[PDB]
Amino acid sequence: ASVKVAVRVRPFNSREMSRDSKCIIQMSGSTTTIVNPKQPKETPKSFSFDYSYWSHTSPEDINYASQKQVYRDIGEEMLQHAFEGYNVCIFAYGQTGAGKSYTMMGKQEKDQQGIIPQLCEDLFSRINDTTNDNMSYSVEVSYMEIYCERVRDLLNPKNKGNLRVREHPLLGPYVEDLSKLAVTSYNDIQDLMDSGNKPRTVAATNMNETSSRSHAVFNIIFTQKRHDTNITTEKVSKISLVDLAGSERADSTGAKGTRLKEGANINKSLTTLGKVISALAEMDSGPFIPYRDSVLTWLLRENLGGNSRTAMVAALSPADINYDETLSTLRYADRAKQ
């Protein structure tokens, strides 16, 4: 498939604990139902996706959907496509606190590594098994945040907030002066995003709370070079893993505490991405897009191409108090494919 969509509900969080929240999410197979806390006497509204991940309990539960599961379904498939020579893209979408970061990066602790860590590990693991002595590989990485059309290099503490995206007359869009580092091992790449991840939540990020109102993009350019007598062949694929800004922040009217240039940019970004993805889906059903409408869809143009593969995971809170924005996330994920 050219587009894949999954939704994932998490355990109650602290806010939901204090409010004595009831669970309004249910799942069976690839289907998720959502109840209206006001009309609990109703028939839940249903939605179907490629995957409906029930992660509301804990790994102690036999039917808890774990980080390894989510990854073997979505991540593994994408990395395989990447070895074929094609670009891929994984997006985590949802309201602030729903589970986007946990799904993408997760926790360094045993058992909770997100999709990025597992994908990087799987990548070097497959690479190190290459017995063919006529095989050469290169892995370059970039880690950045997109805030109000401005890019912050997460891999370099001495040039942030200011980077701007450009468009090469022939090569495509690119961030000027963005660090792109060649890594030769997993322990190495594991340091870069550990380093990039802390940059995401240092005390200073709470000024504009860029942790939840910016898009975090982890890019990996994977080059494969084959040797045969004589020409050497080269396959280069781009992999973009993204932790989108919060969906409830898509408001550009002042609610609630979110600034105009902030939500405007976020609404525009999530809306455009929605058009691009559904557009890619209508396309793959039968068997040019407004990427310029947002810095995010513009920078990732080549990953949302024609032979590109994309997957999205929409994170969902299970709480009654988040019905509105959770319904809103189901619809958004629903439109992306349907």
Ligand SMILES: Nc1ncnc2c1ncn2[C@@H]1O[C@H](COP(=O)(O)OP(=O)(O)O)[C@@H](O)[C@H]1O
């Ligand atoms: N599947 C899950 N398993 C365990 N904890 C999760 C899960 N999904 C979300 N959470 C918890 O909810 C919190 C908020 O989501 P996390 O991804 O930070 O941020 P956001 O959803 O805003 O990107 C974290 O403290 C995390 O531990």
Ligand code: VO4
């Ligand atoms: O992060 V604010 O200045 O919106 O409080």
Ligand SMILES: [Mg+2]
């Ligand atoms: Mg987050």
